[PDB]
Amino acid sequence: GIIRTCRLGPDQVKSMRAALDLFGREFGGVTYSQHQPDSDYLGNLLRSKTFIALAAFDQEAVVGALAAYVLPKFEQARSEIYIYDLAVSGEHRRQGIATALINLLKHEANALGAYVIYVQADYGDDPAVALYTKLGIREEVMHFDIDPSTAT
Amino acid sequence: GIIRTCRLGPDQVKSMRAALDLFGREFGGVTYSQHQPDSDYLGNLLRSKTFIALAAFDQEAVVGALAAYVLPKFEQARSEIYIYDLAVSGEHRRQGIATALINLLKHEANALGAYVIYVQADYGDDPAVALYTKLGIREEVMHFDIDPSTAT
Numbered sequence: 485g486i487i488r489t490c491r492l493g494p495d496q497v498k499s500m501r502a503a504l505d506l507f508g509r510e511f512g513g514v515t516y517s518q519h520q521p522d523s524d525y526l527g528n529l530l531r532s533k534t535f536i537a538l539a540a541f542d543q544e545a546v547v548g549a550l551a552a553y554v555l556p557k558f559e560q561a562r563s564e565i566y567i568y569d570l571a572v573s574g575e576h577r578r579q580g581i582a583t584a585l586i587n588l589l590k591h592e593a594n595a596l597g598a599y600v601i602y603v604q605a606d607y608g609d610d611p612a613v614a615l616y617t618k619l620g621i622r623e624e625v626m627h628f629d630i631d632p633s634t635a636t
Numbered sequence: 637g638i639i640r641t642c643r644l645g646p647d648q649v650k651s652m653r654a655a656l657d658l659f660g661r662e663f664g665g666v667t668y669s670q671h672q673p674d675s676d677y678l679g680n681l682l683r684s685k686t687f688i689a690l691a692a693f694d695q696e697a698v699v700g701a702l703a704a705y706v707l708p709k710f711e712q713a714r715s716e717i718y719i720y721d722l723a724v725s726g727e728h729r730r731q732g733i734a735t736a737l738i739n740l741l742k743h744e745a746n747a748l749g750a751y752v753i754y755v756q757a758d759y760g761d762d763p764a765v766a767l768y769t770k771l772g773i774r775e776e777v778m779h780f781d782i783d784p785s786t787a788t
């Protein structure tokens with residue numbers, strides 16, 4: 485029960501595949517565990533300045549993970565970080581794991597001169613909504629999906 | 637009134653600064669026109685595979701612009717495109733400009749193997765909401781902002 489948090493680098497594709505499994509198990513979409521990208525693709529993601537993979541380790545086991553994207557802005561020299569997925573092992577809930585990964589993300593943001601971190605949640609994901617409401621400021625917005633298949 | 641649409645490259649920082657002015661004027665935030673990043677920063681954005689700047693030209697004038705981010709996914713070898721800003725000159729509305737830039741974005745998505753394009757709107761931006769409702773599928777969601785200043 486000694487938890488370590490870190491940002492994965494491209495030497496850690498093995499721990500990254502294990503974070504992928506955590507997502508699949510926790511979101512029900514094992515979508516995450518078959519059809520995983522090959523090792524070069526994962527390595528290339530971990531090499532980018534614009535993708536942030538964070539993990540919490542129990543021993544060598546991955547018990548929490550967070551994937552976020554850095555969005556370098558165009559109107560001004562500044563950045564925003566967008567949390568895409570965040571999961572914690574079911575056997576490890578209510579132990580501060582999600583909060584520690586978010587805390588590490590803030591340290592990553594500060595190093596990047598990113599001025600805000602933001603994350604989105606569906607109506608009904610009450611854990612998610614409770615966590616983010618404790619940690620940040622809620623706004624409500626609309627999302628639209630567009631199919632590129634219809635290009636003309 | 638011959639409109640041309642294209643994706644800017646790093647040789648076109650001049651047209652990109654003009655797209656920045658269109659945003660500032662159209663969103664009221666001229667935030668967009670002072671404090672612009674320097675030319676290397678803009679050039680580096682235009683060099684990335686992960687940032688998409690699209691513009692519509694009347695002569696040499698920029699009359700529409702769209703900034704989007706490609707999000708290479710981690711669970712699977714695939715991508716999503718996230719439209720950040722989209723603006724059209726006030727003297728050029730109701731002429732198909734926004735729709736053409738979105739159409740070009742779909743061609744960019746198809747070339748990238750991106751499978752979806754998505755965009756967000758505030759309750760009350762009825763042009764935006766009407767455009768996106770004609771073009772895609774609305775969902776409603778929550779957004780939370782987190783201040784990295786509080787890292788511990």
Ligand SMILES: CC(C)(COP(=O)(O)OP(=O)(O)OC[C@H]1O[C@@H](n2cnc3c(N)ncnc32)[C@H](O)[C@@H]1OP(=O)(O)O)[C@@H](O)C(=O)NCCC(=O)NCCS
Binds near residue numbers: 511570579611614
């Ligand atoms: C939400 C989740 C990240 C929680 O992780 P966690 O380590 O157990 O959270 P932490 O221990 O650091 O922080 C707990 C805080 O989150 C909130 N919360 C967490 N789980 C909750 C739950 N099951 N029910 C209600 N509120 C919850 C609370 O606000 C809580 O604060 P508190 O203990 O002071 O009341 C995750 O375990 C989960 O259950 N599902 C993943 C879904 C998700 O987060 N986002 C959508 C997937 S991308």
Ligand SMILES: CC(C)(COP(=O)(O)OP(=O)(O)OC[C@H]1O[C@@H](n2cnc3c(N)ncnc32)[C@H](O)[C@@H]1OP(=O)(O)O)[C@@H](O)C(=O)NCCC(=O)NCCS
Binds near residue numbers: 723
């Ligand atoms: C919204 C905006 C992109 C419209 O651009 P446009 O070139 O005039 O749009 P197009 O001519 O290609 O397409 C028109 C469609 O958009 C919708 N629409 C566009 N402007 C509208 C308006 N002012 N009022 C109501 N609906 C509008 C309609 O659905 C319309 O379809 P229709 O002509 O068949 O009824 C832009 O000009 C604007 O007014 N404000 C920018 C705000 C924004 O788009 N997003 C938030 C900023 S990031």
